[PDB]
Short mmCIF file of C-alpha atoms and ligand atoms in Angstrom, two decimals:
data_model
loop_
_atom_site.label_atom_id
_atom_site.label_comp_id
_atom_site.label_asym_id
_atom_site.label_seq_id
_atom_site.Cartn_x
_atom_site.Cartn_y
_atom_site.Cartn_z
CA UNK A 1 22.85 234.66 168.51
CA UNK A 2 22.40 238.28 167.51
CA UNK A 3 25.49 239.39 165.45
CA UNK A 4 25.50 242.81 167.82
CA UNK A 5 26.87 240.31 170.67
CA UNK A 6 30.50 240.05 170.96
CA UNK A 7 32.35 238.27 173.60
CA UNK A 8 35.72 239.20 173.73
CA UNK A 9 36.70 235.36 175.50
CA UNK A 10 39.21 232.89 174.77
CA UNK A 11 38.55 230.88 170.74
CA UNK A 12 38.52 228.13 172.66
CA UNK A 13 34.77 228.51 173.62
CA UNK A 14 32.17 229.06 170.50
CA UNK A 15 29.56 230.73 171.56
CA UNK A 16 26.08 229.22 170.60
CA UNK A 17 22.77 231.14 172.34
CA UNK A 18 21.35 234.20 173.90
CA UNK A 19 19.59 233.27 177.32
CA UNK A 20 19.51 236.76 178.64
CA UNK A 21 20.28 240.35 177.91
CA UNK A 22 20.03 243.30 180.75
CA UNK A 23 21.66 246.38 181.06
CA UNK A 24 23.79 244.73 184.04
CA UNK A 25 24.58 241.62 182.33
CA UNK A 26 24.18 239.39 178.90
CA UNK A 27 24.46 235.21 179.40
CA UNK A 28 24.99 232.88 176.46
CA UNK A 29 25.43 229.17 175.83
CA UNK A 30 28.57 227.79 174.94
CA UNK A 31 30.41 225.59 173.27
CA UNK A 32 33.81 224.17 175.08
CA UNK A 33 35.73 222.96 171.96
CA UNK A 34 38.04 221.10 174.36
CA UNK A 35 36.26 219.41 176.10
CA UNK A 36 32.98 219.37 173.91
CA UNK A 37 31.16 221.03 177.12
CA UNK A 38 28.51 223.19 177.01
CA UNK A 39 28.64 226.51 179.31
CA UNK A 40 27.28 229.45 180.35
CA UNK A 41 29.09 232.94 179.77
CA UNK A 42 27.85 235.77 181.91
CA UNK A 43 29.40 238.98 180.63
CA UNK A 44 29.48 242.33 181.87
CA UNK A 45 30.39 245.88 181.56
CA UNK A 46 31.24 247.40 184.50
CA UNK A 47 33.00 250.93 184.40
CA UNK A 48 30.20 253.43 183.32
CA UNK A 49 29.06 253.84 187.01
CA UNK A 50 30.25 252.96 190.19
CA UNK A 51 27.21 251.14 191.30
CA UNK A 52 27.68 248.17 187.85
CA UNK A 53 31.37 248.02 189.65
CA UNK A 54 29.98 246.91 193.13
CA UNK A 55 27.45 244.66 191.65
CA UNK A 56 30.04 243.16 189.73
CA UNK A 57 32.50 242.39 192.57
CA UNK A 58 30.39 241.51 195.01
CA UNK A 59 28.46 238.75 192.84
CA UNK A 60 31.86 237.19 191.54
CA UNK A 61 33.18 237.07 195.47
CA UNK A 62 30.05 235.60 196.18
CA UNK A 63 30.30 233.23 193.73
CA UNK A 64 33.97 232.49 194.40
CA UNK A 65 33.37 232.02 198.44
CA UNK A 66 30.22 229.69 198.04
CA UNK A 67 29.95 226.15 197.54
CA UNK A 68 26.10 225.02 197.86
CA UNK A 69 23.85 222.41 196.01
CA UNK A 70 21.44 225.11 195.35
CA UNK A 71 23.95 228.03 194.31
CA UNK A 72 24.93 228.45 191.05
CA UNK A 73 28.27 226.87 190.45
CA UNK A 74 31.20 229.02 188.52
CA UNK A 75 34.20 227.20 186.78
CA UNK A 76 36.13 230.23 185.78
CA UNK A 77 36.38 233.77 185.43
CA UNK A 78 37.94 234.98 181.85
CA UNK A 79 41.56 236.44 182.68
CA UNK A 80 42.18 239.81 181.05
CA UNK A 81 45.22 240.24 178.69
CA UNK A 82 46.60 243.41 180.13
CA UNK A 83 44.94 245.87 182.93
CA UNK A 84 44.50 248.95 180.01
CA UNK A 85 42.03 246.67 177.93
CA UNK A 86 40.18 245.36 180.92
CA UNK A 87 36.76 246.76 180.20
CA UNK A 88 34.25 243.31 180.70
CA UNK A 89 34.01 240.27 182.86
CA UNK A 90 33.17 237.21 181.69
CA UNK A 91 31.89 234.85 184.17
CA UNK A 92 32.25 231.39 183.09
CA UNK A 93 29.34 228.60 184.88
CA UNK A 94 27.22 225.44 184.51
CA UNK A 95 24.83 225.72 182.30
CA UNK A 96 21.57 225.62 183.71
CA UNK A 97 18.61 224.50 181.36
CA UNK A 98 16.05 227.40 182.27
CA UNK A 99 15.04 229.28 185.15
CA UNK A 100 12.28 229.69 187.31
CA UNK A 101 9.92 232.04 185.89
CA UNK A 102 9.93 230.82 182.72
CA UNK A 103 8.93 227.56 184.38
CA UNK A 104 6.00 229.31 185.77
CA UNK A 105 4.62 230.77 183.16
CA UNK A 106 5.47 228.04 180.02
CA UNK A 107 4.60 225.21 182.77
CA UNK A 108 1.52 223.46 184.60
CA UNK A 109 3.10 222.32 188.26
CA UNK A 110 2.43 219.91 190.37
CA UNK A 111 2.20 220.14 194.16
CA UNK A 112 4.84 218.12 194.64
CA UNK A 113 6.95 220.20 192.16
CA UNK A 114 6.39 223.66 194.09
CA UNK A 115 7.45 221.65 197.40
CA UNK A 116 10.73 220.86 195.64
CA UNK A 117 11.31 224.16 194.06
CA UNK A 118 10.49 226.49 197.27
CA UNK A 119 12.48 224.10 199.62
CA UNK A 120 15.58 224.52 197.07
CA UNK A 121 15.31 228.18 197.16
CA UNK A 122 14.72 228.10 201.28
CA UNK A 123 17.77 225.78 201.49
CA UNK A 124 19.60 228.45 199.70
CA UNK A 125 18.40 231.06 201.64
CA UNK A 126 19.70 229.22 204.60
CA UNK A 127 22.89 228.59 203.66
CA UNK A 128 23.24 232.14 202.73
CA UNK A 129 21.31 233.94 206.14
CA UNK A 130 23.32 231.70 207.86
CA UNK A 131 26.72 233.03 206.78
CA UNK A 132 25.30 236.66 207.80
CA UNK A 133 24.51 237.27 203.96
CA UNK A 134 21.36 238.23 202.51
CA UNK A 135 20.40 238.36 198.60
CA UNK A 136 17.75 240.91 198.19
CA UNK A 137 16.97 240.37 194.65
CA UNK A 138 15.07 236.67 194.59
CA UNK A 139 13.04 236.26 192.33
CA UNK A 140 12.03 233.53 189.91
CA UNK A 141 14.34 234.76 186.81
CA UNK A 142 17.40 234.26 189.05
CA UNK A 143 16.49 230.81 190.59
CA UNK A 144 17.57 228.67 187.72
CA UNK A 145 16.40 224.97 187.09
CA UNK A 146 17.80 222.34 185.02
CA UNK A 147 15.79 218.47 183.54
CA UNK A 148 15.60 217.06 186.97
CA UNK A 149 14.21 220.27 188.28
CA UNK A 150 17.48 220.69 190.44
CA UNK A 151 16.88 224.53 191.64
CA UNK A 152 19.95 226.98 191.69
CA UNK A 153 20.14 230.41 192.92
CA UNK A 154 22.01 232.85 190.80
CA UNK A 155 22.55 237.17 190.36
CA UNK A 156 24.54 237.71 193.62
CA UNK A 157 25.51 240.95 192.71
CA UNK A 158 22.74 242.92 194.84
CA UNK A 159 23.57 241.24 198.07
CA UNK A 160 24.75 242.47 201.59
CA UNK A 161 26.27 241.19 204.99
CA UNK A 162 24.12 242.23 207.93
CA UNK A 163 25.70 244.52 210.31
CA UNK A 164 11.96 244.45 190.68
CA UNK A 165 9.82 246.11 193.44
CA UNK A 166 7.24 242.91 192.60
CA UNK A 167 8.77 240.75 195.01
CA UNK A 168 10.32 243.54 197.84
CA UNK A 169 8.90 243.21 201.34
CA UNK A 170 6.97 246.53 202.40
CA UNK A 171 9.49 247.53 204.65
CA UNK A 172 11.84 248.01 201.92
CA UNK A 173 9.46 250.56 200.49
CA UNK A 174 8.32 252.78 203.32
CA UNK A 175 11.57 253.52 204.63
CA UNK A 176 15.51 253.41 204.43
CA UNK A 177 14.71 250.20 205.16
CA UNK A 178 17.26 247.71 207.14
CA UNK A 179 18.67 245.20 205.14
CA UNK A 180 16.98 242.01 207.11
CA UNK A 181 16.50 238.28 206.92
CA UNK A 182 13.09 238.84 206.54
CA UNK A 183 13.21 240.67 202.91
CA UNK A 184 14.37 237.51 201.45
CA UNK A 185 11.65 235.40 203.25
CA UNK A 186 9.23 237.91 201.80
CA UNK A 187 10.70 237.63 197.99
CA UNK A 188 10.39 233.88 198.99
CA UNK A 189 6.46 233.62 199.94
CA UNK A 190 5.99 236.00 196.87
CA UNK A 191 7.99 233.33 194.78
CA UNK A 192 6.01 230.78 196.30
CA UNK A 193 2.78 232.86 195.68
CA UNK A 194 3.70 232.92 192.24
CA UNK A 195 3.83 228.81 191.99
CA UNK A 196 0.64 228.67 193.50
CA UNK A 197 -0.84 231.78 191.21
CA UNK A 198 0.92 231.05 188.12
CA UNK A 199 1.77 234.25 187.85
CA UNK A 200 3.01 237.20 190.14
CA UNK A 201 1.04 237.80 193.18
CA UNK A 202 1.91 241.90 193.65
CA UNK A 203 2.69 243.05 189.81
CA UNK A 204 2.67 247.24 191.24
CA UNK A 205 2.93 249.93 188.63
CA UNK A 206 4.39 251.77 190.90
CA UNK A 207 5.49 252.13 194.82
CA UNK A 208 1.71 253.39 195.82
CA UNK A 209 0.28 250.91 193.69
CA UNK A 210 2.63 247.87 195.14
CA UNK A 211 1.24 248.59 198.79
CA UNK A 212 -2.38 248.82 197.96
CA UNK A 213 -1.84 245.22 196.14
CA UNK A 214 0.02 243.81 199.18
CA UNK A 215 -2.72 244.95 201.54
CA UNK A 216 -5.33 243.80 199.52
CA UNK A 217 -4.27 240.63 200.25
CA UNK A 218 -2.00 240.55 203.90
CA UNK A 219 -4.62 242.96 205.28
CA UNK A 220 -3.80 246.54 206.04
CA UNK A 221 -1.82 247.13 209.59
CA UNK A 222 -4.56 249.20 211.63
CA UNK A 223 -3.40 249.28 214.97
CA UNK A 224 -0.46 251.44 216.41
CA UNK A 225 1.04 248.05 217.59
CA UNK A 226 1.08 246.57 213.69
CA UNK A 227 2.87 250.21 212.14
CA UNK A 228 4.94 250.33 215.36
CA UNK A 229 7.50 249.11 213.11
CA UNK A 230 7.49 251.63 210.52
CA UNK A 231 10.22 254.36 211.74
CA UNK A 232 8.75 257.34 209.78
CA UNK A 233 6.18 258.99 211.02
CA UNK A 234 4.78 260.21 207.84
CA UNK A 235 5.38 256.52 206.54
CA UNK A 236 2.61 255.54 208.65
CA UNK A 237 0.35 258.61 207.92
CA UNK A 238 0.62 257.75 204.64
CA UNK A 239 -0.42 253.95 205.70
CA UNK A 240 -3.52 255.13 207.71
CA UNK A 241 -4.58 257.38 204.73
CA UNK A 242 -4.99 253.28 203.36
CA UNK A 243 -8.53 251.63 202.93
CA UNK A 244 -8.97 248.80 206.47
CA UNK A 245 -8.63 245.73 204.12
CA UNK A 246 -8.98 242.45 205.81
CA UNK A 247 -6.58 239.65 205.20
CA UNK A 248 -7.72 238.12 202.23
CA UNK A 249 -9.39 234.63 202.69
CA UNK A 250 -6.32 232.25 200.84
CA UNK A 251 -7.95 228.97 201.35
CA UNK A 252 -10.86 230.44 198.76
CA UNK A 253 -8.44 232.18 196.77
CA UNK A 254 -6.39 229.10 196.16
CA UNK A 255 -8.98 226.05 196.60
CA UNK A 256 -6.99 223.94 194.53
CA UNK A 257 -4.33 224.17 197.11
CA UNK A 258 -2.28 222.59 199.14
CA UNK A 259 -3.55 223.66 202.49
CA UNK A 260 -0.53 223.44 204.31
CA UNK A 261 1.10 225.27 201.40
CA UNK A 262 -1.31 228.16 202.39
CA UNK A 263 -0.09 227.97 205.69
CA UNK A 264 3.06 228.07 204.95
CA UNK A 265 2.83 230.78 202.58
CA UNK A 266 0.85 233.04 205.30
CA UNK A 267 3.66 232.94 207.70
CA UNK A 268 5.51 233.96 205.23
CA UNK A 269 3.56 237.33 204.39
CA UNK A 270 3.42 238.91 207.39
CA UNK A 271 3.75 242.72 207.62
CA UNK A 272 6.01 242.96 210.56
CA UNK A 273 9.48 241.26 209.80
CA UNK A 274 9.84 240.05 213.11
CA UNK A 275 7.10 238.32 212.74
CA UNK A 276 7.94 236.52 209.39
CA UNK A 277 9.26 232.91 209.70
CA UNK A 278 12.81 232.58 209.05
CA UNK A 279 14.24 230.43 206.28
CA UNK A 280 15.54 227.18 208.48
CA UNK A 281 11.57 227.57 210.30
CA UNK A 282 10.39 227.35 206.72
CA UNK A 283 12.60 224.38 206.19
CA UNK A 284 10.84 222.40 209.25
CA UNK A 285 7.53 223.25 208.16
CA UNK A 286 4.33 220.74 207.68
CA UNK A 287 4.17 221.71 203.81
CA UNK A 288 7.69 220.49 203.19
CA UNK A 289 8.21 217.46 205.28
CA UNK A 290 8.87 215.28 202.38
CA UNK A 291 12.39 217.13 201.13
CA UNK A 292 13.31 218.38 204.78
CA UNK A 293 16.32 216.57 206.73
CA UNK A 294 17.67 218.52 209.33
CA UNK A 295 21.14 216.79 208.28
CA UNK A 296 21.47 217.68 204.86
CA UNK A 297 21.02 221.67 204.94
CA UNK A 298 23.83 223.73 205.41
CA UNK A 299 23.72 226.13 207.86
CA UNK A 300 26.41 228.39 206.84
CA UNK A 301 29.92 230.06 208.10
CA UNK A 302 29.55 233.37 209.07
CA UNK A 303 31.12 236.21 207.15
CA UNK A 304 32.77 239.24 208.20
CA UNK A 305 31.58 242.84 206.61
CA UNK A 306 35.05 243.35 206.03
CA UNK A 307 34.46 240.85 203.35
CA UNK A 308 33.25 243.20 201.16
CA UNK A 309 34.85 246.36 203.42
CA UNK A 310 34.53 248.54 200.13
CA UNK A 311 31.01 248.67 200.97
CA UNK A 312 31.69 250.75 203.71
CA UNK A 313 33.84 253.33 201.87
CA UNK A 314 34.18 257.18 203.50
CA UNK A 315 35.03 258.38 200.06
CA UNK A 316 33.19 256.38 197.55
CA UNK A 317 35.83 253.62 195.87
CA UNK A 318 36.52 255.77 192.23
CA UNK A 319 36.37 253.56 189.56
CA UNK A 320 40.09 252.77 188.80
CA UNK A 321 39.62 251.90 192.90
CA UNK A 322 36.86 249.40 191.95
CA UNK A 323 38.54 248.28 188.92
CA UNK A 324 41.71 246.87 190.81
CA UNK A 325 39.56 245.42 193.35
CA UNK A 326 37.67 243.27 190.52
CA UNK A 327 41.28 242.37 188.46
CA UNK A 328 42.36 241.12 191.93
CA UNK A 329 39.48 239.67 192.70
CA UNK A 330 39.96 237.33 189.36
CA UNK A 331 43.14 236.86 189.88
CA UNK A 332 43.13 234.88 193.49
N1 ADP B 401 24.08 229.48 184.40
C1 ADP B 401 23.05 229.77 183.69
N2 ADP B 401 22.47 228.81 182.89
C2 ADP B 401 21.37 229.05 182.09
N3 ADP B 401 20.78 230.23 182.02
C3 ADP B 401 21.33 231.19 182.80
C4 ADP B 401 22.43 231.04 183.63
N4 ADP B 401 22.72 232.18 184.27
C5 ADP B 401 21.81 233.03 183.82
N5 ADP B 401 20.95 232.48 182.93
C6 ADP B 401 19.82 233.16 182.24
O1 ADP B 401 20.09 234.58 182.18
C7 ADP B 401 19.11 235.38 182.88
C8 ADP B 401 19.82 236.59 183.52
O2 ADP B 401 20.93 236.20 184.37
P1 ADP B 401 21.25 236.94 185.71
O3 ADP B 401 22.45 236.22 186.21
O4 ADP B 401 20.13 237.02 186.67
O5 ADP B 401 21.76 238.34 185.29
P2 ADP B 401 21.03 239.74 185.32
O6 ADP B 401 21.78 240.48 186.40
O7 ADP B 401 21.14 240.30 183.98
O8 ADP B 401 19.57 239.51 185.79
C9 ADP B 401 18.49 234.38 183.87
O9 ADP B 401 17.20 234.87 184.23
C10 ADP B 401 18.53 233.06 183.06
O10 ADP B 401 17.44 232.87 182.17
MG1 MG B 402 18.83 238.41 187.24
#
């Protein structure tokens, strides 16, 4: 517990570790003197910029609107004294034991425990695409796991109702990309990658760097009909001005795997979005038949935009604007 972290929270908690520390957001452990529970305390400082605002209230509204097995359950959200010393939020949730990537790379996997880990985060997904919502920031550090490898998916504050650049899909990258489905099924075969791998399929130094690994391995798009789905022009000048790489050969990059896993993961990795399988397809699939019932995942509620209408602001929201919207937000 570093003495430069303070948590202005209730004496009621004691707080006991350090489990992250971004410039978005800090979580510790800790101690419920009440009720001798242990939580987690996600706290963050919001009003430098407007963007840490919207981050902020869209991952606590999130987190206040969803009930899911494999979302990341809050039990309270810190109420502020007075509205002039308002100045951090301090989420208050189950404590999870670890998370996903340091899983990966502490841990040796079995098959059967990437099966169970990638159908978690695909149920999730679901859920989530299902209610018109995507994520667009999976990745292993924000799918947390606890002992009996129970999978939750956590940092909401990124997301987006429809209508790390190591796990964002191409699209994402060449132009103002759409926000689609298919960017989270891409985080989710680079996640699932990653199990396979042990470590991070498409680790890019740099936007020109990320493409020429995810090439390397999906196979460069040659024909008009494969960039046909790249709106800028120049986008796919820039593509063509690419070496022809052929889609790598999985089944002799990963011998030691599954084969339907590599199946699985190749439909996954596709270069044209539409052509990506979507999360509940993924759920059906060969490689997961021994988690999947069709009765027991959650296929969501939809959500209007208007849910997070702010997100649409002329004038962007100033940050007094923003800050009302989160006290209100806590307080409901
Ligand atoms: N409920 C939780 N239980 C245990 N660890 C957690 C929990 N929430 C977050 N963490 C730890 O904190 C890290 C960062 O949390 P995250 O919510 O993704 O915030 P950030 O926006 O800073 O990435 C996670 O990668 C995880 O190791
Ligand atoms: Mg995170």
């Amino acid at each position: 517990m570093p003495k430069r972290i303070v948590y202005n929270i209730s004496s009621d908690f004691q707080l006991k570790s350090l489990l992250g520390e971004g410039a978005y957001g800090v979580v510790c452990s800790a101690t419920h003197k009440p009720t001798g529970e242990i939580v987690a305390i996600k706290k963050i400082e919001p009003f430098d910029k407007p963007l840490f605002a919207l981050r902020t209230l869209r991952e606590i509204k999130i987190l206040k609107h969803f009930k899911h097995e494999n979302i990341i359950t809050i039990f309270n959200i810190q109420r502020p004294d007075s509205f002039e010393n308002f100045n951090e939020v301090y989420i208050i949730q189950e404590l999870m034991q670890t998370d996903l990537h340091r899983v990966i790379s502490t841990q040796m996997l079995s098959d059967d425990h990437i099966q169970y880990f990638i159908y978690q985060t695909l149920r999730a997904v679901k859920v989530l695409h299902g209610s018109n919502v995507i994520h667009r920031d999976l990745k292993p550090s924000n799918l947390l796991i606890n002992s009996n490898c129970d999978l939750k998916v956590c940092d909401f504050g990124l997301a987006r109702i429809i209508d790390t650049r190591w796990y964002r899909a191409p699209e994402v990258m060449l132009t103002s990309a759409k926000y689609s489905r298919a960017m989270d099924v891409w985080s989710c075969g680079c996640i699932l990658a990653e199990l396979f791998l042990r470590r991070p399929i498409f680790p890019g130094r740099d936007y020109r760097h990320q493409l020429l690994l995810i090439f390397g391995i999906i196979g460069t798009p040659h024909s008009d009909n494969d960039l046909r789905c790249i709106e800028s022009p120049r986008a796919r000048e820039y593509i063509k001005s690419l070496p022809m790489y052929p889609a790598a050969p999985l089944e002799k990059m990963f011998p030691r795997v599954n084969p339907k896993g590599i199946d699985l993961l190749q439909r996954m990795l596709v270069f044209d979005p539409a052509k990506r399988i979507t999360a509940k397809e993924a759920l059906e699939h060969p490689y997961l038949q021994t988690y999947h019932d069709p009765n027991d995942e959650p296929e969501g509620e939809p959500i209007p935009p208007s849910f997070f209408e702010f997100d649409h602001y002329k004038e962007a929201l100033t940050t007094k604007d923003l800050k009302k919207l989160i006290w209100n937000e806590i307080f409901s």
